[PDB]
Design a binder for these strands. Structure first.
Ligand SMILES: [Mg+2]
Lengths: 298, 213, 222, 813, 244
RNA sequence: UAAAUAAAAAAA
């Protein structure tokens, strides 16, 4: 299945980008506002960017660690696409170019980066370990899937609580949420993912050698803008003033200076997003109990 | 596994006079079928062969037929999948001489052989080689029952791990399988398997006559 | 029977909905009629691609059964002969179980049926009639028939039931019983008392459903 | 490979020698290996100057001044014995061969441990790495006695993991040792060789059960590379002194390097000198005040989470609006709660509560009257907790588990939701409260004629701090009926305390220090001392009276399952060390013949020159005493119900139900005894009772420990912050340190030898004379210190050369 | 059991190299004439890579055919004996490998116009015989050489490089030990330009470092590019001499 | 959910 786009659309949107205009009425460095909604259960988070809707669910179960890593727990991230986000996606297509890329971006941003403290997922060394699972559900698509997913996974992990455990060797009674409160998963850092789309002016005249048409670069492109881009760039940054990961495969060849500018622009966005994410975690944490102060011991 | 139900992955499996019975045409799902049961001493083998074809292949320009054979483990998981493929390759090297391929252009014949059971008794203070002549017997029956033209009746025998398949009344050879055993058994195995062939042949011919009648 | 639903929430799909009963929340999407794969093609009728996604983990054989039962309900509902050699993708993403998924799949199935129907309505696909599904259960001591049981009620149940009926004539005439999935063991008197009280609350639901459909859709029309 | 490497070094010397020939600079190879020396002596290839370490030192011009530092004097490295076979175990058990004991590690030597055994009067010692055989303090262990050739007296050296075998580094062969350790080892061995009073020693062959929980510690900076992000094998020093250090492998060595972390032991195999564990979590920085507290509560296994939502439903629907009924015979009230009919109305009485100044959880109130027959009426009222806390509820279940309230310096940890503790059960002033009241009828000589118990509603006339009550009694201006009763209480208090001491009551002492705020509620000003007023005797004596009357009543009603509290007599062995020194030094002794002789001789342990000495000995006697223990009456026979310390035949805890669980049970048993309600079958089942006592003895102990360690922590920071100078008394003398106890805070510390002198190697230790002789730092004169010596002490930040850590250690002024 | 460091105060690394040394580079063109239209055997350090370019040729399935451009396919076979410790399982389906394959495709889709071979297919088969750090950079160089040998038109060279960072200063061309010790950056450089086809960072990297690290890599990649031109031209001179 | 000779007493 190949989507059909009119030649008229391809000429219109491209010309509009040369006039610094876009369909959804945004800027080039602007990122669509992200809305984060938490469900009743911990680990249930819904991320919304304009029309883009993604849902993440964090779950865990008692499991045994690998032989190679007796002190580390298990952690996996699932991002299987479905025709619900659009008929362009094949059901279970986990080997397609865009799918594998997205899967690899998230993995290198959360798993590989060590955003989650897997060492704190161990109950008894080389015997029993917690197995945290992050399931991302792509409900609908209006672009920015990678950005939506990173926010969804991280917000979920920071939301998530795991039943309190008392361990005495090989026997462990997992206290229920009724008996005692659940324990929040450890976090080392908060990675945020930014997606950049590159374009070509296709214009006859440039006013100056000194100042030139250069390259088109926008942030968080919509579905219509994502099909017309000539280049893809994803940079992951945090509030710790460091680059988590950056993935550029082919596309429109760009200077090292341009990448840095995108990287510096993304840093201002990930700062606002991280603080906002923490805020909505703070508002939901205080939200849960109508009578919590009456509840307290210490 | 999201395809089947494998259960808990943290668990572990359990750790601890020649006689023939031939029946064909008992499966209505395919074009030809066969049941072969053999009991010798403490060792017995029961396998089922299913034949589907000849069915037309769209766009096929082959001037002859195409045979595909696959062995399966019905119950006991003993034989390796790698070894099953090897026998399958051996079996196809046999029936490509037996089956009149010129009769089925642009067509293909799929052959499924289910090794539902084999029972082995070993005393304490190869293996699949013994099943091979029974697989050949089953397929040759299932093909003849299906209506597939065979140039000759294919049969074989197992002598000290040396399997050799015969046609044209033992005058020629359509397959040879030798594993381990002992040397200088060339002349002996050729004579012992030739007797097993002739024995398996007459019972195979009689089988068709019986059921066909 | 205080359910709540929304229609047309997804942008890149021909039709969508979000059905919620108690905890149980299911979002559904429908694209069709569209070009089918060769292996899906039906010479005369419409081909249905039905997908069910669980609230936790990946789709297993459990959801494969949810897809099968949901197929038995949606198939006779759709006027399939209107779309020969064509495809209709129907995807259900269960967002919240509302029940112990390790033991039951009752409420998730009923919510998927109601959501799928609503998504088909939104998509504008030819339907022969209307449809509604409710989960029912029976208590261990009291043996009472509880319509729309909670998760806590299911734990202490002796039998669990999924009932989906086909309605015509302004939601007053039961054309047929699309699906009845009873797991457990039964007594005849309880069954018909269940069907009598069940029909009443179902009829009340349709009336409520009609109200919701008109209230949301009328502002769009002229 | 060893010969190649030696040849490599030799090649380097050969190269350097040839390379530096034009500059007339030779090279000297300092090696103790006989292979390199022989290869150079033969002079086969090139000329290389090879000297051994000792041989090289003897070529320095100043041989004398640096000689003394230098030491003078199929192979398998030592290893721990394998755990005994089960067949061997069951064969030994049947033949009488083996016994198992709970190993308590000594508090200043982590390599000395003891195990109590019935056969033996003193604790059987277990000494050294090998004989300890990988045990941890707490572990259930099986021991075997060693031959008498191996028996030892209590060690005369102090030790921890941080300061033993400090060379070794964990990983996931040849071994060497340090000169002080060597010499220290020689001195210790010599001490062992000559000492009289050796004691039974054993060795660990198996462990019945293990005390590995999650623990708290901080990394050894000396095992960590602070600037490397690689994963690292490293050493964790645990917060408990007794525990051996632990080897863990961690990706975050450098990040965790100034964190107070939590770890868990995974194994301790024969072929590893240290246990292996693994990182669990990071509580935050080592200076963090908050994390130390969370750390403290983990080390003590104390719950402090918000009470389970489940618990809340048990709490009354109307929360803070809850009100004692106006009319006890009110019909709506009587339907909502039928037990009310049996409740007495004691409000007309003049009840007051005497509690500590920041006391919000008030357990009890008292009242007085003069009866027309000349006798006095004295009554005691206690929070009616079991009216609100019902058996089998989630609230009872959380309280039973918690077992006790835990009081930290900056925190109070509640057993019960504070709606109960600080509002509805608290005997608040001016508000009608339910209560359990025992009222006596006694004469002017404070002799009990009769005693009664009941469930009642009372109104608190006034809630006092202790001082206000004393002033109102003293002033002589106020002679109202209430004050006249208060003086009557004090007069009878003197009589009761007199008779009790004559009966053989103990008078131990440990008046710990207190802390005060500035105008700000969290800004601290001063450290002071709480003074015992005559009213304090006044509350304690009537609490004692309440508890004794209650124990007799409930043991009467339930002879098999009564909730009681006993206290064993100390063995003479408990007082062996303390008694001998006093007798030797001053020829003055304390008598173990009875508790009265114990109390009287203790009273007479007086130094006229210094008042404090008597308190020093009193606090040191307290340490010796065996643990008092809750028990159910059916577990022992009557003579074993004995409370030694209190010199009464039967005792229990009744007076504090809100803050202890024992009381809750006693309360139910008393309500059972008086026919107010039937006793829950839970407290009539010996097996459930036995499990309850086990738990609450454990929760009681843990709470005492946590209490003390919070005080020690804050006091430790506070003295340093002040720069203040405070006196200390010497209660222990080892070969390499002393232990001082402080009167103001009453907290012991260890001053280590190399924190007492710039030169340890010249120190004299005498084990008969209990004497340490040394040359102080910042001074030149030899100093003698003995046990019982008044000294002066202070705290400052020392950095250890061996341990790269810079903690704030206790020093001698 | 042993322990090791990264960069000594003497400016020496674990293997003996200093902070700015490229490993031994050997390059080889037309190694498999009877197996592919273009072929290259790469030896960059202990890394050993066979690269085969088969095409442009007829697609095996008409379903997969583009009438505007050629279809470019890349399959990387990391053999089970590439490392010191033989891997039990195959690495073919591994998500890490799928990302690598995808990454390489994205890179060269913009580097070959791929508009002059319509209705054809270019299949690139790669066999990694031995691995020792910077395998991604070596994969890039192997494809570029093999493609040129096949006479397939492209706009410019694409050179791949490996970067190692310790403290203040990164180390050029990292091996497995260094890769294990510290985070690395893999750079795809087009021709002699400053434009990157591939920027790959999988581990944590201080933000201050990258600008300087990039500068070192680009300079080193230029040297690598110069060597490649020398490697092919030198071979041509050698081949001509052999002919003579 | 096992099990000790592991700090007396009072109020917190
Ligand atoms: Mg009080």
């Amino acid at each position: 299945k190949d989507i059909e786009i009119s030649a008229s659309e391809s000429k219109f949107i491209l010309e509009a980008l040369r006039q610094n205009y876009r369909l959804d009425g945004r800027s080039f460095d602007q990122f669509r506002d992200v809305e984060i909604t938490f469900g009743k259960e911990f680990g249930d988070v819904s991320v919304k960017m304009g029309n883009t809707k993604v849902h993440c669910r964090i779950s865990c179960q008692i499991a045994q660690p690998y032989e190679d890593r007796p002190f580390e727990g298990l952690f996996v991230i699932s991002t299987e696409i479905s025709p619900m986000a659009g008929s362009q996606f094949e059901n279970g297509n986990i080997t397609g170019e865009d799918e594998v890329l997205c899967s690899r971006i998230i993995e290198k941003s959360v798993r590989r980066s060590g955003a989650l403290d897997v060492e704190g997922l161990c109950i008894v060394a080389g015997s029993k370990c917690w197995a945290v699972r992050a399931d991302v559900h792509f409900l609908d698509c209006d672009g920015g899937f990678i950005d939506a997913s990173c926010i969804a996974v991280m917000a979920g992990l920071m939301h998530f609580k795991k039943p309190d455990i008392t361990v005495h060797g090989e026997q462990i009674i997992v206290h229920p949420v009724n008996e005692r409160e659940p324990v929040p998963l450890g976090i080392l850092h908060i990675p945020i993912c930014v997606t950049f789309s590159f374009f070509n002016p296709q214009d006859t005249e440039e006013n100056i050698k000194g100042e030139t048409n250069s390259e088109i670069s926008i942030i968080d492109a919509t579905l219509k803008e994502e099909l017309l881009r000539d280049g893809v760039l994803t940079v992951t940054l945090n509030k710790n003033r460091e680059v988590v990961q950056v993935s550029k495969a082919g596309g429109l060849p760009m200077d090292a200076l341009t990448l840095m500018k995108c990287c510096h622009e993304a840093y201002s966005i990930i700062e606002k997003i991280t603080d906002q994410i923490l805020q909505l975690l703070k508002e939901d944490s205080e939200k849960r109990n109508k009578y919590a102060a009456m509840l307290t011991s210490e | 596994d999201r395809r089947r139900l494998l259960g808990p992955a943290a668990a572990k499996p359990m750790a601890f006079e020649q006689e023939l019975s031939l029946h064909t045409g008992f499966i209505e799902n395919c074009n030809g079928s066969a049941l072969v049961e053999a009991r010798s001493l403490g060792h017995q083998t029961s396998l089922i062969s299913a034949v589907y074809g000849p069915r037309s292949i769209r766009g096929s320009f082959t001037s002859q037929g195409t045979i595909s054979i696959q062995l399966k483990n019905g119950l006991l998981e003993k034989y390796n999948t790698n070894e099953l493929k090897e026998v399958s390759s051996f079996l196809m090297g046999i029936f490509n001489s037996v089956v009149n391929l010129s009769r089925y252009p642009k067509s293909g014949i799929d052959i499924f052989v289910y090794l539902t059971y084999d029972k082995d008794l070993t005393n304490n203070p190869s293996q699949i080689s013994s099943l091979i002549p029974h697989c050949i017997t089953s397929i040759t029956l299932a093909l003849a029952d299906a209506g597939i033209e065979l140039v000759d009746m294919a049969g074989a025998g197992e002598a000290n791990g040396t399997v050799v398949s015969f046609i044209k009344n033992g005058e020629e050879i359509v397959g040879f399988w030798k594993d381990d055993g002992d040397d200088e058994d060339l002349l002996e195995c050729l004579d012992r398997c030739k007797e097993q062939y002739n024995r398996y042949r007459d019972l195979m011919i009689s089988c068709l006559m019986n059921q066909e009648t | 029977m205080s359910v709540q639903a929304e229609i047309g929430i997804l942008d890149h799909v021909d039709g969508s909905s979000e059905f919620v009963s108690q905890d149980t929340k299911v979002i559904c999407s429908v694209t069709g009629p569209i070009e089918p794969k060769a292996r899906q093609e039906l010479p005369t009728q419409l081909a249905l691609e039905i997908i069910v996604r669980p609230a936790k983990g990946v789709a297993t054989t459990r959801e494969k059964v949810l897809e099968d039962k949901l197929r038995a309900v949606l198939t006779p509902l759709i006027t399939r002969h209107c779309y020969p050699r064509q495809l209709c993708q129907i995807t259900c993403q269960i967002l919240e179980s509302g029940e112990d998924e390790a033991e039951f799949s009752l409420r998730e199935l009923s919510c998927c049926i109601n959501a799928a129907f609503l998504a088909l309505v939104d998509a504008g696909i030819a339907l022969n009639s209307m449809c509604a599904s409710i989960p029912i259960a029976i208590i261990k001591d009291t043996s009472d028939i509880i319509v729309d049981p909670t998760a806590e009620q299911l734990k202490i149940s002796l039998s669990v039931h999924t009932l989906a009926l086909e309605f015509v004539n302004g939601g007053k005439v039961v054309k047929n019983v699309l699906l009845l999935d009873s797991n457990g063991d039964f007594n005849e008197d309880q069954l018909f008392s269940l069907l009598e009280l069940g029909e009443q609350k179902c009829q009340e639901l349709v009336t409520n459903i009609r109200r919701i459909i008109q209230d949301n859709i009328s502002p769009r029309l002229v | 490979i060893n010969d190649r490497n030696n040849r490599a070094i030799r090649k380097t010397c050969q190269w350097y020698s040839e390379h530096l020939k034009p500059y007339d600079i030779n090279v000297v190879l300092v090696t103790n290996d006989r292979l390199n020396r022989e290869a150079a002596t033969k002079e086969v290839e090139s000329n290389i100057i090879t000297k051994s370490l000792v041989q090289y030192i003897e070529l320095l011009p100043n041989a004398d001044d640096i000689r003394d530092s230098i030491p003078q004097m199929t192979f398998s490295d030592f290893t721990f014995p394998e755990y005994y076979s089960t067949a061997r175990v069951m064969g030994g058990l049947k033949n009488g061969v083996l016994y198992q004991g709970n190993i308590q590690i000594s508090e200043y030597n982590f390599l000395e441990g003891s195990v109590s055994l019935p056969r033996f009067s003193k604790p059987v010692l277990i000494v050294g790495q090998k004989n300890l055989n990988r045990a941890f303090n707490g572990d259930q262990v099986i021991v075997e006695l060693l031959p008498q050739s191996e028996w030892k007296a209590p060690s005369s050296i102090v030790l921890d993991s941080e300061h033993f075998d400090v060379n070794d580094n964990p990983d996931i062969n040849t071994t060497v040792i340090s000169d002080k350790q060597r010499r220290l080892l020689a001195k210790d061995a010599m001490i062992a060789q000559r000492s009289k009073k050796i004691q039974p020693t054993a060795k660990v062959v198996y462990i019945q059960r293990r005390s590995w929980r999650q623990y708290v510690g901080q990394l050894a900076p000396s095992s960590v590379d602070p600037q490397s992000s690689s994963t690292q094998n490293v050493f964790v020093i645990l917060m408990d002194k007794c525990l051996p250090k632990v080897r863990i492998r961690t990706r975050r060595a450098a990040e965790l390097l100034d964190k107070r972390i939590v770890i868990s032991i995974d194994s301790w195999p024969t072929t590893h000198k240290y246990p292996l564990g693994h990182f669990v979590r990071d509580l935050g920085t080592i200076e963090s005040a908050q994390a130390e507290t969370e750390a403290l509560l983990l080390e003590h296994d104390v719950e402090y989470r918000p009470f389970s939502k489940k618990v809340l439903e048990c709490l009354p629907a109307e929360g803070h609006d809850w009100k004692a009924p106006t009319k006890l015979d009110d019909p709506e009230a009587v339907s909502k709660d039928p037990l009310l009919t049996k409740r007495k109305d004691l409000r007309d009485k003049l009840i007051c509560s005497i509690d500590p100044p920041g006391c919000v959880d008030i357990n009890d109130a008292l009242h007085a009257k003069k009866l027309p027959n000349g006798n006095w009426e004295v009554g005691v009222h206690i929070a009616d907790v079991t009216h609100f806390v019902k058996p089998g509820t989630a609230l009872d279940a959380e309280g039973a588990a918690r077992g006790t309230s835990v009081y930290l310096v900056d925190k109070r940890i509640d057993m019960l939701p504070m709606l109960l503790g600080t509002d509805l059960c608290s005997l608040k002033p001016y508000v009608d409260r339910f209560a359990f009241s025992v009222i006596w009828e006694l004469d002017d000589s404070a002799n009990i004629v009769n005693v009664n118990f009941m469930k009642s509603v009372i109104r608190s006339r006034e809630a006092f701090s202790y001082e206000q009550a004393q002033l109102r009694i003293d002033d002589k201006t106020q002679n109202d009926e209430l004050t006249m009763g208060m003086r009557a209480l004090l007069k009878l208090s003197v009589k009761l305390k007199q008779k009790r001491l004559e009966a053989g009551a103990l008078n131990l002492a440990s008046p710990e220090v207190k802390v005060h705020m500035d105008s700000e509620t969290s800004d601290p000003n001063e450290v002071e001392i709480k003074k015992l007023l005559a009213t304090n005797s006044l509350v304690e004596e009537f609490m004692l009276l309440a508890n004794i009357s209650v124990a007799r009543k409930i043991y009467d009603a339930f002879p098999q399952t009564a909730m009681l509290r006993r206290h064993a007599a100390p063995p003479s062995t408990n007082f062996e060390i303390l008694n001998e020194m006093l007798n030797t030094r001053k020829n003055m002794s304390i008598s173990l013949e009875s508790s009265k002789a114990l109390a009287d001789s203790l009273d007479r342990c007086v130094d006229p020159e210094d008042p404090y000495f008597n308190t020093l000995v009193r606090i040191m006697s307290t340490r010796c005493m065996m643990a008092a223990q809750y028990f159910y009456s059916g577990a022992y026979s009557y003579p074993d119900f004995r409370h030694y310390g209190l010199a009464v035949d039967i005792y229990t805890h009744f007076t504090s139900p809100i803050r202890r669980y024992c009381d809750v049970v006693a309360h139910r048993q008393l309500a059972g005894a008086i026919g107010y309600e039937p006793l829950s079958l839970t407290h009539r089942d010996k097996n459930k009772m036995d499990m309850i006592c086990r738990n609450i003895n454990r929760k009681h102990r843990n709470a005492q420990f946590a209490g003390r360690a919070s005080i020690e922590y804050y006091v430790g920071q506070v003295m340093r912050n002040n720069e203040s100078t405070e006196t200390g008394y010497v209660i222990k003398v080892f070969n390499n340190g002393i232990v001082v106890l402080v009167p103001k805070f009453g907290v012991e510390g260890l001053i280590r030898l190399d924190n007492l002198t710039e030169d340890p190697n010249s120190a004299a230790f005498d084990e008969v004379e209990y004497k340490l002789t040394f040359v102080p730092t910042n001074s030149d004169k030899p100093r003698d210190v003995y046990v019982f010596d008044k000294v002066e002490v202070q705290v400052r930040s020392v950095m250890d050369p061996i341990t790269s850590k810079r903690k704030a250690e206790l020093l001698l002024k | 059991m042993s322990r090791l460091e990264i960069y000594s105060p003497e400016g020496l690394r674990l293997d003996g190299r200093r902070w700015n040394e490229l490993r031994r580079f050997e390059s080889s063109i037309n190694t498999h004439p009877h197996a592919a239209d273009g072929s290259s055997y790469m030896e960059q350090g202990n890394n050993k890579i066979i690269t085969l370019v088969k095409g442009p040729k007829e697609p095996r399935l008409k379903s997969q055919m583009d009438t505007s451009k050629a279809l470019l396919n890349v399959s990387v076979n990391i053999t089970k004996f590439s490392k010191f410790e033989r891997s039990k399982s195959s690495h073919k389906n591994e998500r890490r490998v799928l990302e690598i394959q995808t990454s390489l495709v994205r890179m060269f889709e913009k580097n070959v116009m791929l508009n002059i071979y319509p209705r054809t297919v270019i299949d690139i088969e790669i066999h990694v015989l031995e691995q020792d750090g910077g395998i991604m950079g070596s994969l890039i160089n192997g494809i570029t050489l093999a493609l040129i040998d096949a006479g397939i038109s492209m706009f410019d060279y694409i050179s791949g490089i490996s970067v190692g960072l310790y403290d203040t200063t990164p180390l050029l061309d990292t091996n497995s030990l260094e890769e294990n010790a510290m985070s690395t950056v893999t750079l795809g450089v087009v021709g002699k330009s400053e434009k990157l086809s591939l920027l790959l960072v999988e581990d944590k990297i201080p933000l201050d470092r990258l600008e300087n690290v990039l500068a070192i890599g680009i300079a080193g990649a230029h040297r690598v590019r110069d060597l490649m031109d020398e490697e092919l031209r030198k071979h041509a001179q050698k081949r001509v001499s052999n002919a003579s």
